Design an enzyme around this catalytic site. Sequence first.
Site, mmCIF file in Angstrom:
data_model
loop_
_atom_site.group_PDB
_atom_site.id
_atom_site.type_symbol
_atom_site.label_atom_id
_atom_site.label_comp_id
_atom_site.label_asym_id
_atom_site.label_seq_id
_atom_site.Cartn_x
_atom_site.Cartn_y
_atom_site.Cartn_z
ATOM 1 N N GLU A 31 0.374 -1.047 -0.295
ATOM 2 C CA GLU A 31 -0.021 0.006 0.107
ATOM 3 C C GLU A 31 0.618 1.541 -0.108
ATOM 4 O O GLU A 31 0.322 2.142 -0.142
ATOM 5 C CB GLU A 31 -0.566 0.267 1.311
ATOM 6 C CG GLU A 31 -1.918 -0.986 1.245
ATOM 7 C CD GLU A 31 -2.400 -0.373 0.038
ATOM 8 O OE1 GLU A 31 -4.355 -1.614 0.128
ATOM 9 O OE2 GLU A 31 -2.892 0.372 0.264
ATOM 10 N N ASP A 71 -6.931 6.587 -4.477
ATOM 11 C CA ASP A 71 -6.130 5.812 -4.955
ATOM 12 C C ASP A 71 -6.362 5.128 -6.442
ATOM 13 O O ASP A 71 -6.591 5.491 -6.948
ATOM 14 C CB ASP A 71 -6.538 4.817 -3.565
ATOM 15 C CG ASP A 71 -8.160 4.276 -3.673
ATOM 16 O OD1 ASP A 71 -8.845 3.713 -3.141
ATOM 17 O OD2 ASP A 71 -8.390 4.540 -5.283
#
Length: 164
Positions: free
Chosen positions: A11, A20
Amino acid sequence: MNIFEMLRIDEGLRLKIYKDTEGYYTIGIGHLLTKSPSLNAAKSELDKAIGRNTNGVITKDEAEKLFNQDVDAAVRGILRNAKLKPVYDSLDAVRRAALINMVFQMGETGVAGFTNSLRMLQQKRWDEAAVNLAKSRWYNQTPERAKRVITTFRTGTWDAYKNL
């Protein structure tokens, strides 16, 4: 290697609101803030999440505290879920980390939908399951990460991450 280091690799770490891969407002270590298009809705969720006026920016410590909660919630989610629990219980420690990783990324509901793959994992048919998991939007959308997770399920080792 452990679940924390693993997810930290997958991540990344960002101290300022960002979008994202799906275009959603996120901060820290993959902490989804809102699916809403408003940066303003994001900042508001952010402040509620942190308990201060952040103004869209948080500290390393804050990021980590959010990360600790998210991992805990991911594990508890699996433990509470009737489709997930039995698979988790059946797995060795490394593969368990692989299932937590999917759940952190896509939510309990999402992973629970991988019915066939879940059955294969439970039956310990590694190769078969790896092939089935790759037939998903998930794999198509984030192939680099998906490949690392799948390899983890296929081998039961941290090889895919030893690189990184």
